[PDB]
Structures are given as structure tokens and as C-alpha cells.
Write a protein that binds this ligand. Structure first.
Ligand SMILES: [Ca+2]
Ligand SMILES: [Ca+2]
Ligand SMILES: [Hg+2]
Length: 316
């Protein structure tokens, strides 16, 4: 009888992931998931495959590796959710995941993941999981701004409110939730630098470029500085970081549109060749060589290393 759905929903409701969930609320999801039981050494996701599913892991460690044509595979480890970014992007697998122990869990397709994303509270829980995974790839950098104050530079993390359907015309039949979740793990089409107070402290400013379209050479820039933090050189510092990444990813021109009595954004843009025009004022500028950012070569390299690390971590 099809009451195996009922046993399955109770199994789902027993996960830390679904803490506080009522098993009945999970029955429609239970319907869309298939049990997974892999033996140690079993390949869960093969590099080079199309992305057909994601996995929700009840238990067992897995190990991630990326194979190349010029030496041995680069190995890691994610000690909960696997495979979901390439699934929602419809991109091929860029890495292989292997069970390092017995692995028990559940497998679903994109529709099953969209079901999870719409359950109460679960979109934010998925975003915290993505955040924890990414935080492993981020080492905040202590930076000294013009005034001598010390702050910390890092890429944005999923769930930073600073992060918030343009470029995502590459996803078929999407929902808003699917697109919002992808927005939280996009670093290539939309790169955001953040400045924090303390290495594990609050974000007090952010700067970003948003490409005009997927892979496009023109991007809209936008800096935001906490009311207390203007004048202090934080904005122009983030601007430097953004050239390193923009240069690194292929963006070649920046553009801006701001409210006119917003003089501080204006001065950030006046700082390279900005020529405003009314509408709200407008302007658009070239992307200067990495040679030309006023940072020590050491700082520049840590910024490019950070950029690279997060983009790869999101399979871009
Ligand atoms: Ca962090
Ligand atoms: Ca698609
Ligand atoms: Hg729930």
C-alpha cells in the first residue's frame, strides 16, 4: 500500500534539517524523494554528468574532488545538501562526490527541491546551509582604511541581507524561489564585496557589480556604506577589491545610476573619470588594469585568491 509515504515522511521529520516539522506536512515531499543508501567508496555524483538530482544526507561523510588533465584530483570534503546548484542551473557536474563512509539519505529532482524551498521556514534554512558550506571557503582579510581604522574584507555570504530575476533567463520554467536561491550562490554574474566590523562581525558596507546579462562585459556597480562609515575611505577601498574581481572575471566596463543628493556615491565614481547625466544622475566608466589599484601586490593577490576560491566553490 502507498502508506510507505507516511513512513517516509516520519523519517524525513526525524532529520535535524526538518526539526520542528510535522510529519504530515512532509508527505507531499516524501512522495518526490527516493531513498539513498551508498556504500563506502561509491560515486554519488560524477564530474562531467548532467545534474539530474540533489541529495539530502541523513548520515555519512562524503568527499569532493575535481579531476583535471594536468595532475591528480584536487580533493576536499563537505563533512547535508549536495548537488543542488548544478541541478538548478542545469549545468554539468564540475566535481565528483564519493561516499567516504556508508551514506544514507534521499534523492530528489529540481521539482522536489522547489517543494522544500516553499515549505515554511525552509528557504532560510537552506540558505544557512549554503552559507556554512561557503564560509569554509572564505578567510576575511584585515584591511586598513584611509583613516587608520581596521576592518575586514570578504566576499558576501548567502543570507547576508546585503546580497539583496535578471540574468536568470537561463533557467527553464523557473519559480521565484528557485531564482532567489540561485541569487544567493551566484558569484560570477554578480559579485559582492563586503566590509565587516571584526572578522566575524556585522557588515557595515558592500560594493558589487551586476553584469548586464550572463557573462556580459558591462556591469552596473553599486556601493553601500553604513551611515557612520562614510568619509572614512571604506567605499573606495571596496572599489579597489571590485576591480580585482571584475578584472579577474572578465568585466570590462562599469556603470552607475544614483540619486543626486547622494554625494558620497558620486565621489566614489568621480574618483575615476565619472561624468554624470540627469534623469537621478547617470554615468559609465572603463575597468582599469589590476596594475593600477592602490593596494600592495600582497593585498591584491589575497583578493584574487578570495575571488577565485568562492567562484569555484559555487561551481562557476
Ligand atoms: Ca566568515
Ligand atoms: Ca533549465
Ligand atoms: Hg516543515
Amino acid at each position: 500500500v502507498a502508506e510507505l509515504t507516511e513512513v517516509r515522511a516520519a523519517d524525513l521529520a526525524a532529520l535535524e534539517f526538518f526539526t520542528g516539522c510535522r510529519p504530515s506536512a512532509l508527505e507531499p515531499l516524501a512522495t518526490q524523494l527516493r531513498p539513498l543508501k551508498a556504500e563506502p567508496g561509491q560515486v554519488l555524483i560524477r564530474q562531467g554528468d548532467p545534474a539530474l538530482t540533489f541529495m539530502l544526507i541523513e548520515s555519512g561523510r562524503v568527499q569532493v574532488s575535481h579531476a583535471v588533465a594536468d595532475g591528480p584530483p584536487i580533493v576536499l570534503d563537505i563533512e547535508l545538501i549536495i548537488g543542488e546548484i548544478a541541478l538548478l542551473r542545469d549545468a554539468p557536474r564540475t566535481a565528483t562526490v564519493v561516499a567516504a563512509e556508508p551514506v544514507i539519505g534521499w534523492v530528489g529532482d529540481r521539482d522536489a527541491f522547489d517543494t522544500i524551498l516553499h515549505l515554511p521556514g525552509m528557504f532560510d534554512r537552506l540558505v544557512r546551509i549554503a552559507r556554512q558550506r561557503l564560509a569554509a571557503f572564505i578567510t576575511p582579510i584585515p584591511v586598513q582604511v584611509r583613516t587608520g581604522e581596521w576592518f575586514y574584507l570578504r566576499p558576501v555570504l548567502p543570507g547576508d541581507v546585503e546580497r539583496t530575476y535578471r540574468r536568470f533567463q537561463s533557467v527553464r520554467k523557473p519559480t521565484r524561489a528557485l531564482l532567489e536561491y540561485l541569487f544567493e550562490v551566484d558569484y560570477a554574474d554578480h559579485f559582492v564585496w563586503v566590509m565587516t566590523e571584526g572578522a566575524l562581525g556585522p557588515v557595515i558596507a558592500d560594493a558589487r557589480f551586476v553584469r548586464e546579462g550572463h557573462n556580459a562585459t558591462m556591469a552596473e556597480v553599486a556601493f553601500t556604506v553604513g551611515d557612520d562609515y562614510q568619509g572614512r575611505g571604506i567605499g573606495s577601498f571596496l572599489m579597489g577589491a571590485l576591480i580585482v574581481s571584475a578584472n579577474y572575471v572578465g568585466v570590462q566596463r562599469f556603470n552607475a545610476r544614483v540619486l543626486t543628493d547622494n554625494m558620497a556615491m558620486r565621489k566614489i565614481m568621480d574618483r575615476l573619470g565619472a561624468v554624470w547625466v540627469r534623469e537621478v544622475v547617470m554615468t559609465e566608466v572603463d575597468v582599469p588594469p589590476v596594475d593600477t589599484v592602490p593596494f600592495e601586490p600582497e593585498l591584491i593577490d589575497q583578493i584574487r585568491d578570495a575571488t577565485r576560491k568562492v567562484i569555484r566553490a559555487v561551481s562557476q
